[PDB]
Design a binder for this molecule. Structure first.
Ligand SMILES: Nc1nc2c(ncn2[C@@H]2O[C@H](COP(=O)(O)OP(=O)(O)OP(=O)(O)O)[C@@H](O)[C@H]2O)c(=O)[nH]1
Ligand SMILES: [Mg+2]
Ligand SMILES: [Mg+2]
Lengths: 242, 131, 249, 99, 136, 256, 204, 96, 145
RNA sequence: AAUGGAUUAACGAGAUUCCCACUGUCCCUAUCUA
RNA sequence: GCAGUCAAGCGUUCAUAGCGACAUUGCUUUUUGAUUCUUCGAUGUCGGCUCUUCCUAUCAUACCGAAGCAGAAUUCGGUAAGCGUUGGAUUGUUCACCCACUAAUAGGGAACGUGAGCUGGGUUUAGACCGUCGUGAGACAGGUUAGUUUUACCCUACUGAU
């Protein structure tokens, strides 16, 4: 768990993408946001400056995991060639054409089980299961249509937005096979997917994230080497006050 | 540019277009949605009596009887006979994505074609039985 | 509003506050008329200066009555620190004197515009302008004593610590010269003096610490001597309502 | 209260997977990350962190990051060359392939 | 720019002047918006404050729920239908005018956005881009 | 100027009649004026008149003059000329004050659209004054003479500048010309509260209605007044209802 | 914040290094700047400086000591040209102040000739008393003697030297026999055109 | 009166009198001064303007929102044949 | 009355002279001007074939658009490609001074890199770059065989 | 109150207010012909 | 403003024949921020579209000064007119007052700038109605409606041209 801010915005998942085996950042202005990932990840995995369609918002235009990576229609051939040169030859890269272009708001995923937008086509439901190698489920989180913004995942656990019902979590945790908590990030912002990035060993959120808000994120994602998620019951007295 | 063409073909007064209308007829689920819209206050026939070919609401059920028996509505039937001219037809003409183009023409000849004609046959089976 | 009072601009004494507003309507408004003008221009010239000065005193008075924290219905703790420290009677009387002094400026301004519309010459319209400014200066010179009191309660109310009664606090109470200041210095980050004499802290000092992912604030007391139990020093009386009202350990 | 705690219970009551498969799914931490040192802020010997490579030649608005020189080719001799991207008509990225 | 908008905003064609009715693109319940003023605007004799793509305007609602009508509230324009210039060599325009409504911090009121969202608007405002189903 | 002509005709007159709406006199009359009459001009008489009493039933208008008889004499009246009610009575009431003053100016104070300048037209029994259902008729008062002694004066109507008293009953009294409301559709649930179920169904006669947003389109499809493109005009139907509330085409009255 | 914090910062850090040099070199120069402001400040800044500089010499020397004109009729009458074509120069308006009586009830506009306006009607007057030196705000009851004609007695023009009949109910004076006095005679002393106050010395 | 709505002037007073020039070749008013250590180098040049065209360019500009992106822009093309020298002129500084 | 394309009030009653700043009608254009900070992109050579080809295009073409420029012929000399718009019109003489002072902004220091030069015809809505493209796209014609 | 008053369908180159449609009146000016 | 009080000065020499700055007291509708919903006869015509210029008594921006000025913000005060001061809503209306933006919505002058530039909306004929007064012709305390002044080619000024 680490507090980091893009230029003065607490929104991290808009501006950055983080998988188990690679990280993607924007090119905005100065390399202060870029080095704040290398302080935690280092030389081990490639952290790549890129743009998608000449934009900074690359955490919401792409969607991928440690197997594959998906870029939308409007990605130029230079920005597609530039990603392939940087990444090693393990990760699959494929340009996806669809009706809708925001792949970040639409495909929430871990390495293993992904959710999609309900109005997504049957042709790319094939393509997601081919590249990412994951099981695809058509689902809404409490009847919200954008699953990439209001739900974050990893192989450890997942975090959902606090308007989600108690029944809807247990119904949806059967599909994802991970523990889930209705949580808030960046002082009560419901948008929990764009608020933070997370993989199986690191979480990066904004400076507005408070000290009780790090308590749930550290617990439900099991970040330290001595946190089996059972201590979120010992953190109940913090959450009763919050 | 002119006087008459500006009055009807501004960006404000644009009709639907020929591309989407072929998609609405092509399956049996979207036909049953448009024939059975929920009634709306902001629509001319209060959200009933909608023609699918001409994207156009009619005032009264009498105004469908006199609309189908006209040379205006027999354009749009004759207009929607074949392949609906996507972007892919224009790219194939320059020597660019034939196999993307020819496979879609292969599917309209085989699959999407007789599914559309078995939908337009049922509209005349329905709009004569109710009118 | 709640939890803090820093947003009160100032107040000048009556020799300065009269000096500002009457200088304001000389620089802003036009100032040159001639006796050969039309009577409508000369009448509507002095109608402008009476009303504009009249609003000039009220816009300063609306900056006083809006800023001060309205001691009744704040909270029975914030009311009662200000009872011992600021003496509710002198607080409520002086602000109600200005609210009386605000409404009298509106009465003089609405009369001497209304009487001025029948001035038939320059030598008559000039005198209604001067009498309209003089009777406003009478209200200001009479208000000389409550303004100097309100300046000094403005300089002290900004420096009070920010506490919330509904939040979880803890009170540290005991005798003077015991160690309750030195306990506060080691428990949290706060600049509280640790000098070895009896009454060092004369006001409530607050420091913040964190236990189990939360926010705790530690309120220091001045330290007390009970001896008659009914009357007590105002330095010492600040402790008792910090014990009575504040619902925490 | 007993009408408001079920709102708070929506955060506290965690979800359970019900275990719904035969297939086993395990998290993945690459061993280069495990072998890596932890970055220490004040250190006589720490890694450069291109924040600091930026600052020593110009500030933040004037340093120019080469987006190249940081990627993996089979030969680093041609890491700076230029894709033509257009010949006479019909741009290059539609023609290239394997074989 | 102002509050909320991260970065700077380039010059594009001003499509929407004062008193221009435009559609509403979220699921909040408003159908059309009605602009009364444009923030960040200039000041010149006899001009009209004109909006563009990716601006924040103060806008009222003419048709919608009676909880929402008769109160001024900020709004962000996401579609223009006046042709502007992307800096790669193309002009483009949308089918209609559209805008979503938000608080002055720039945070969305609804939960989803129907129809395509402009690219220059999605760069300038992050909270729009979280709720945008379609970009461009 | 609307108060400058009021303080001219209060100072002039001897007996000030005050017209009160028989639909709702207590929300109608004034609040600052009656308190002013006792403090600076105590020798004046300040009588009430309840007009528009054919709009209300028999026992209710007889109940308003009895409750108000404990402070003022409060005549009961109908303001029309060809079939009047109380024509000889208020003439006989003004023969009592002028006999005490053995000229006497009598000004007609009141609330707007309550019928000041139509009672002079049935006292003079000719067309002296301008009458129209829109509120803002006269800018100035005019001397109107009968008996050689009593002089009728009609001030323009006076709205007491209180904030509440309401934000929206200002439409329900005949105060604002209702063409100039920015949104008239929200006031349609207000007139369901005043007007009963049978009275609204005796005039428009269609059916049972629920949820006033539905009731407007029940009327707008029956009137056939609709925008180009098959669209019911929510403004132009709500304007006609809010006029017919003020012009008295629908029966509504506050119970005593 | 967090009660008084500058005076704690004075103790634990000091004012400055040269804070005792600069402050001492202020009033060494202030003997030269008072003579500098008096020769500069052209135009009303040399007026209010000289009014406050002269108020300081008075305040320091105290510590050393410790140890009817004729009113025309062309004024107070205004030509009111009435009608559509403004040619009816008949009507007149009193432009000076007037007591109007308790029960007044204005005459009709077609019938009247002389106009007493609404704003210039002072009912009450400041009644100062020479014996006991107390100014009491008392209402006016009648206008007995008006100079410069007997005509403005009936009208009520209240310029100066007008003897008015003022009640005394709050004072409660005791007469011979002690019944009680309830009214007196007072003479006004200032023109009420210059101010809305009407000052009247009660004649003793 | 006092104009009631202040507004900027229409037109620039610097470029007056607006009149036809003296020749089709515009004269040069002032040159870069002299750095008397430098090699000999010419200070101006003259050629013939001919048309416009468009240019795309990969903008390499630190700090901008178009850093490392492509930008279309319009240039002029001025026909510039080699120019041959025929004379030398010397100037004496006077107090005029 | 008396027109609408004009200044209405040309003066007040004092001074009794039309002042020198009230925008009368007269000559427009053909003034001399000086426009500074124009940036050279490209200095081609006359003997250099393929001037319009950048490092990307690699298509042997000259900067002369098809059918030459409009109201001006072919280029076949040295040229300067400078951005923005020089005051003047076609077939006119310009004079190119150099910078008058050491410029300070970072815009004076950027190393430009051209990626494509347009050479479609300016005499119409031109679509093709080289006359070999037009014969490639249209196919053969009736006057060809 | 036949010095005539209240009411009202139809009609009006009569006087006033608003709503849809519409548009260089306007934002902001440009261009073509006689 | 009136009525006192105090007294450095002034009054041919002068305390007390008599004036009186600088201060201050008399209430001018109620000592506990409740409100005051009070607009009280502007007898008279300029206002606005376009456009230019000028004062400083500065509303913003430059630089200083002083205050419980921790910062953040915000006030008082000086030098300064280079530059900038808006878009709308109700009456012929300026008068009078809101809505929002903005760095700020500063004040004035030039025959209360500007009709042989515009406007005729309103100012002033003859037509007609209602109200008051008159026996009457008619006038008005008054309200409403309808309604003709139309060069420039002259010398100068100014913008351009030999
Ligand atoms: N049915 C009925 N209508 C009435 C009655 N009295 C008045 N009205 C109507 O109410 C309208 C308003 O009367 P007005 O004389 O204009 O009242 P006002 O607004 O005070 O008039 P002004 O004093 O000139 O301003 C009239 O036009 C009548 O049509 C009544 O007694 N019965
Ligand atoms: Mg101690
Ligand atoms: Mg009426």
């Amino acid at each position: 768990a680490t507090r980091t801010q893009f230029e003065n915005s607490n929104e991290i998942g808009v501006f950055s993408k983080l998988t188990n085996t690679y990280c993607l950042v924007a090119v905005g202005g100065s390399e202060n946001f870029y080095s704040a990932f290398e302080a935690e990840l280092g030389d081990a995995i490639p952290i790549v400056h890129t743009t998608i369609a000449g934009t900074r918002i690359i955490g919401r235009m792409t969607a991928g995991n440690r197997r594959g990576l998906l870029v939308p229609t409007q990605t130029t051939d230079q920005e597609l060639q530039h990603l392939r040169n940087s990444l090693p030859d393990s990760v699959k890269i494929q340009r996806v054409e669809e009706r809708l272009s925001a792949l970040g708001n639409v495909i929430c995923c871990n390495d293993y089980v992904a959710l999609v937008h309900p109005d997504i086509d049957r042709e790319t439901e094939e393509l997601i299961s081919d590249v990412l190698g994951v099981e695809v489920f058509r689902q809404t989180i409490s009847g919200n249509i954008l699953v990439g913004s209001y739900c974050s995942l990893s192989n450890q656990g997942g975090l959902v937005h606090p308007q989600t019902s108690v029944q809807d979590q247990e119904e949806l945790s059967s599909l994802l096979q991970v523990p889930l908590v209705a949580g808030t990030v960046n002082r009560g912002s419901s948008v929990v997917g764009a608020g933070m990035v997370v993989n199986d060993y690191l979480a990066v959120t904004g400076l507005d994230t408070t000290a009780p808000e790090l308590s749930v994120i550290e617990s439900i994602f099991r970040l330290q080497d001595a946190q089996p998620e059972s201590i979120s019951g010992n953190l109940r007295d913090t959450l009763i006050e919050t | 540019m002119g006087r008459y063409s500006v009055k009807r073909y501004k960006t404000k007064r644009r009709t639907r277009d020929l591309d989407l209308i072929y998609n609405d007829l092509s399956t049996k689920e979207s036909v049953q949605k448009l024939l059975n819209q929920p009634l709306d206050e902001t629509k001319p026939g209060l959200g009933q009596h909608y023609c699918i070919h001409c994207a156009k609401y009619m005032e009264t059920a009498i105004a469908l009887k006199t609309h189908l028996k006209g040379k205006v509505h027999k354009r749009r039937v004759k207009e929607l006979r074949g392949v609906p001219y996507t972007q892919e037809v224009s790219d194939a003409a320059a020597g660019y994505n034939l196999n993307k183009f020819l496979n879609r023409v292969q599917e309209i000849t085989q699959s999407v074609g007789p599914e559309k004609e078995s939908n337009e046959a049922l509209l005349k089976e329905h709009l004569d039985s109710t009118l | 509003m709640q939890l803090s009072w820093k947003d009160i601009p100032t107040v000048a004494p009556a020799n300065d506050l009269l000096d500002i507003v009457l200088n304001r309507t000389q620089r802003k408004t036009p100032t040159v008329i001639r006796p050969g003008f039309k009577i409508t221009r000369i009448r509507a010239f002095y109608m402008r200066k009476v009303k504009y000065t009249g609003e000039g005193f009220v816009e300063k008075f609306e900056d006083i009555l809006k800023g001060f924290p309205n001691i009744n219905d704040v909270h029975p703790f914030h009311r009662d620190l200000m009872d011992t420290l600021y003496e509710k009677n002198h607080y409520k009387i002086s602000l109600a004197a200005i609210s009386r002094a605000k409404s009298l400026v509106e009465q003089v301004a609405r009369d001497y515009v209304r009487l001025l519309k029948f001035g038939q010459s320059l030598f008559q319209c000039k005198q209604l302008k001067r009498a309209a400014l003089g009777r406003m200066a009478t209200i200001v010179k009479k208000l000389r004593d409550p303004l100097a009191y309100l300046e000094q309660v403005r300089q002290h109310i900004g420096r009070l610590p920010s506490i919330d009664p509904n939040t979880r606090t803890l009170l540290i109470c005991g005798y003077p010269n015991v160690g309750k200041s030195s306990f506060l210095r080691c428990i949290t980050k706060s600049d509280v003096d640790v000098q070895p004499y009896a009454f060092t802290t004369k006001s409530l000092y607050v420091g913040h610490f964190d236990y189990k992912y939360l926010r705790f604030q530690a309120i220091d007391t001045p330290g007390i001597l009970d001896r008659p139990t009914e009357e007590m020093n105002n330095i010492e009386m600040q402790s008792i309502y910090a014990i009575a009202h504040l619902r925490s350990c | 209260s007993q009408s408001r705690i079920n709102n708070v219970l929506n955060k506290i009551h965690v979800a359970q997977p019900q275990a719904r498969d035969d297939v086993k799914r395990t998290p993945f931490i690459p061993e280069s990350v495990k072998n890596l040192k932890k970055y220490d802020p004040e250190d006589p010997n720490r890694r450069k962190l291109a924040r600091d490579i930026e600052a020593e030649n110009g500030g933040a608005g004037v340093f120019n990051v080469n987006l190249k020189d940081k990627y993996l080719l089979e030969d680093d001799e041609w890491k700076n060359d230029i894709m033509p991207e257009i010949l006479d008509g019909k741009n290059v990225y539609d023609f290239l392939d394997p074989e | 720019s102002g509050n909320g908008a991260q970065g700077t905003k380039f010059r594009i064609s001003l499509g929407l002047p004062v008193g221009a009715i435009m559609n509403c693109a979220d699921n909040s319940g408003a159908r059309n918006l009605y602009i009364i003023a444009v923030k960040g605007s200039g000041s010149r004799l006899n001009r009209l404050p004109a909006a563009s793509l990716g601006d924040m305007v103060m806008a009222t609602v003419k048709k919608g729920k009676p909880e929402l009508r008769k109160k001024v509230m900020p709004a962000i324009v996401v579609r223009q239908a006046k042709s502007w210039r992307r800096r790669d060599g193309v002009f483009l325009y949308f089918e209609d005018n559209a805008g979503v409504i938000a608080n002055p911090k720039g945070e969305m009121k609804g939960s989803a956005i129907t129809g395509p969202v402009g690219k220059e608007c999605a760069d300038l405002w992050p909270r729009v881009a979280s709720n945008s189903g379609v970009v461009v | 100027r609307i108060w400058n002509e009021l303080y001219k005709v209060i100072d002039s007159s001897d007996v000030v009649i005050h017209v009160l709406d028989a639909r709702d006199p207590l929300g109608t009359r004034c609040k600052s004026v009656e308190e002013y009459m006792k403090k600076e001009t105590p020798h004046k008489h300040l009588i009430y008149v309840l007009n528009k009493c054919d709009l209300v039933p028999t026992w209710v208008a007889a109940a308003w003059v009895k409750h108000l008889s404990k402070e003022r004499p409060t005549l009961a009246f109908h303001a029309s000329i060809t079939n009047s009610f109380g024509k000889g009575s208020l003439i006989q009431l003004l023969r009592q004050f002028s006999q005490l003053h053995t000229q006497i100016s009598v000004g007609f104070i009141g609330y707007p659209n309550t019928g000041k300048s139509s009672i002079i037209n049935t006292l003079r029994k000719k067309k002296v004054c301008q009458v129209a259902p829109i509120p803002g008729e006269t800018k100035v008062w005019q001397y109107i003479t009968l008996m050689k002694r009593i002089f009728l004066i009609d001030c323009p109507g006076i709205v007491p500048p209180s904030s509440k008293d309401s934000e929206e009953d200002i439409l329900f009294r005949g105060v604002v010309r209702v063409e100039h409301v920015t949104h008239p559709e929200q006031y349609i649930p207000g007139v369901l509260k005043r007007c009963q179920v049978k009275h609204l169904e005796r005039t428009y006669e269609i059916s049972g209605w629920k949820d006033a947003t539905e009731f407007i389109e029940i009327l707008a499809r029956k009137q056939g007044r609709l925008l180009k493109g098959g669209e019911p005009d929510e403004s132009g139907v709500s304007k006609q209802i809010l006029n017919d509330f003020n012009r008295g085409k629908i029966p509504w009255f506050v119970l005593p | 914040p967090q009660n008084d914090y500058i005076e704690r910062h004075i103790k634990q850090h000091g004012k400055r290094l040269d804070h005792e040099e600069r402050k001492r070199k202020r009033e060494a120069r202030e003997s030269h700047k008072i003579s500098e402001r008096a020769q500069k400040l052209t135009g009303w800044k040399g007026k209010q400086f000289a009014k406050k500089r002269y108020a300081e010499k008075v305040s320091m020397r105290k510590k050393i000591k410790a140890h009817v004109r004729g009113i025309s009729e062309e004024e107070m009458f205004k030509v009111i040209k009435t009608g559509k074509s403004r040619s009816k120069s008949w009507k007149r308006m009193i432009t000076k102040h007037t007591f109007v009586g308790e029960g007044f009830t204005r005459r009709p506009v077609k019938m009247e000739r002389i106009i007493r306006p609404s704003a210039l009607r002072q009912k009450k007057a400041n009644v100062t008393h020479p014996e006991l030196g107390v100014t009491v705000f008392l209402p006016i009851l009648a206008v007995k003697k008006n100079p410069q004609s007997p005509m403005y007695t009936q009208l009520g023009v209240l310029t100066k030297g007008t003897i008015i009949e003022v009640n005394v109910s709050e004072l409660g004076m005791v007469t011979a026999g002690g019944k009680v006095v309830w009214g007196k005679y007072a003479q006004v002393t200032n023109e009420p055109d210059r101010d809305g106050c009407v000052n009247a010395v009660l004649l003793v | 009166s006092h104009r009631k709505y202040e507004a900027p002037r229409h037109g620039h007073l610097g470029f007056l009198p607006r009149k036809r020039a003296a020749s089709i070749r515009a004269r040069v008013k002032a040159f870069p001064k002299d750095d008397r250590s430098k090699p000999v180098a010419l200070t101006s040049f003259l050629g013939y303007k001919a048309g416009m065209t468009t240019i795309v360019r990969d903008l390499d500009r630190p700090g901008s929102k178009f850093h490392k992106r492509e930008v279309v822009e319009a240039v002029t093309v001025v026909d510039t044949p080699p120019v041959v020298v025929v004379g030398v002129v010397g100037y004496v500084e006077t107090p005029r | 009355h008396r027109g609408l394309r004009k200044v209405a009030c040309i003066g007040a009653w004092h001074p009794a002279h039309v002042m020198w700043s009230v925008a009368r009608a007269g000559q427009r254009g053909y003034h001399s001007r000086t426009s500074i900070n124009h940036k050279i992109y490209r200095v081609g050579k006359g003997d250099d074939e393929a001037n319009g080809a950048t490092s990307f295009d690699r298509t042997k073409k000259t900067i002369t658009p098809m059918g030459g420029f409009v109201h001006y012929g072919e280029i076949k000399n040295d040229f300067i490609m400078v951005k923005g718009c020089i005051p003047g019109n076609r077939k006119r003489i310009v004079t190119l001074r150099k910078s008058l002072y050491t410029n300070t902004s970072r815009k004076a220091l950027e190393e430009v890199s051209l990626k494509w030069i347009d050479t479609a015809s300016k005499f119409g809505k031109g679509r093709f770059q080289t006359p070999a493209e037009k014969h490639a796209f249209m196919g053969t014609l009736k006057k060809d065989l």
